[PDB]
């Protein structure tokens, strides 16, 4: 009961994008999509729907125009298209399944970020935050545009003590970030750290080793 | 178009706490009324459909009510899990239209940092950039002061901070501080230190290393 969304991406002004929505093992049977926006800060706002086998597709008079929304059950995948992208537009695009009796959205996509900019990628560089009864240690992930960036622990493994900071703006016009995590110190001298950073816009994919001072 | 108005639109509460969130259509809805919970930078999950309906999974503290235009979401003990905004949505009729929102966040007791310092990587270096990083670690609130002193020299307009968010096991914040400067900048100073305020503390704690030694 999954649904996977497309890679986030920048677009220039007045160009198109078009974000996917993969139901995961065929189940657009008997299940509407819908496409849900939120501007970042905002709330939800809802965009159109699709009941995917007849085609039929329900857009929000705000959007009349601008977005289509599709639908191909060979691949059982949906599709929103939106033109003419204005700075408005940056937002992260979610796909729902939408259930017909009650009219409930019980399952969402992870999100797509879509970022207006006349600015083109830039992938970060990843460097190590080296540890000095608990010591933590850490990556940071610097210099990079759009957002967003991925990180996890050794492929997943670590999860406890993690705290991944939200990325700041610099002067620079570009964004950082750091995560960074606690262990004893014990473990140290023995247990070997990764971190894995992921920038999905510029298909950048860096695993950093980080190593005592 | 039917409107959605959600009251209030933020609130604080200590864990146990009984919290009710009020949803408001512009016109008859019946028991077309759904409630999401977004934590942040996730997506948002179904917690509750035909205005009263449990979807499977969520835990029975959550609860829904009413029908026609007067709708009420109530958790009846808060827990620090519970940090998110929540949404509600009617589908009674299209365009499916939702409320503005209501962030719901946990009042817990003080607790202090646990102050860590980085100073910059090597490979960083070579790029002709430093990055010192200061961490303030699992503390409540999220007020603190975060003081760089370069050879006892105190800075001004060239680190940035960054908090977490509530953490989902016990309420607290996590804040980097990050000053940046360029190598030639860096070079011309030995103390990098970093003094910390914050009312968890009996006093200010800081954190500091000499450039260059092992």
């Known amino acids: ?213 | 178009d039917i409107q959605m108005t959600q009251s209030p639109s933020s609130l604080s509460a200590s864990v146990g706490d009984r919290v009710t969130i009020t949803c408001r259509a512009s016109q008859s809805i019946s028991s077309y009324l759904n409630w999401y919970q977004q934590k942040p930078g996730k997506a948002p999950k179904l917690l509750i459909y035909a205005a009263s309906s449990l979807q499977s999974g969520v835990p029975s503290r959550f609860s829904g009510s009413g029908s026609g235009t007067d709708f009420t979401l109530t958790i009846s003990s808060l827990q620090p899990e519970d940090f998110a905004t929540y949404y509600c949505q009617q589908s009674y009729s299209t365009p499916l239209t939702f409320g503005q929102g209501t962030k719901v966040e946990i009042k817990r007791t003080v607790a202090a940092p646990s102050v860590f310092i980085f100073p910059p990587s090597d490979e960083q270096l070579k790029s002709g950039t430093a990055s010192v990083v200061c961490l303030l670690n699992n503390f409540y609130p999220r007020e603190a002061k975060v003081q760089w002193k370069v050879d006892n020299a105190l800075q001004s307009g060239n680190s940035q901070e960054s908090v977490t968010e509530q953490d989902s096991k016990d309420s607290t914040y996590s804040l980097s501080s990050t000053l940046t400067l360029s190598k030639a900048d860096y070079e011309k100073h030995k103390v990098y230190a970093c003094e910390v305020t914050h009312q968890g503390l009996s006093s200010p704690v800081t954190k500091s290393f000499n450039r260059g030694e092992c």
Not at chain 1, 32 to 41: E, F, L, N
Not at chain 1, 169 to 178: C, F, T, V
């Open chain 1, 1 to 213: 009961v999954q649904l996977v969304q497309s890679g986030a991406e920048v677009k220039k002004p007045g160009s198109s994008v078009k974000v996917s929505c993969k139901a995961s093992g065929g189940t657009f049977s008997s299940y509407a999509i819908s496409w849900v926006r939120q501007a970042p800060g905002q709330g939800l706002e809802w965009m159109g729907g699709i009941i995917p086998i007849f085609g039929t597709a329900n857009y929000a008079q705000k959007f009349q125009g601008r977005v289509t929304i599709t639908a191909d059950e060979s691949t059982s995948t949906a599709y929103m298209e939106l033109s003419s992208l204005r700075s408005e537009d940056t937002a992260v695009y979610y796909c729902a399944r939408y259930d017909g009796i009650y009219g409930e959205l019980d399952f969402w996509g992870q999100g797509t970020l879509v970022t207006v900019s006349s600015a083109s990628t830039k992938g970060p560089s990843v460097f190590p935050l080296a540890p000095s009864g608990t010591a933590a240690l850490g990556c940071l992930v610097k210099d990079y545009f759009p957002e967003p960036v991925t990180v996890s622990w050794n492929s997943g493994a670590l999860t406890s003590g993690v705290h991944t900071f939200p990325a700041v703006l610099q002067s620079s016009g570009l964004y950082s970030l750091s995560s960074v995590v606690t262990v004893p110190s014990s473990s140290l001298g023995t247990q070997t750290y990764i971190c894995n950073v992921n920038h999905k816009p510029s298909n950048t994919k860096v695993d950093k080793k980080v190593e005592p001072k």
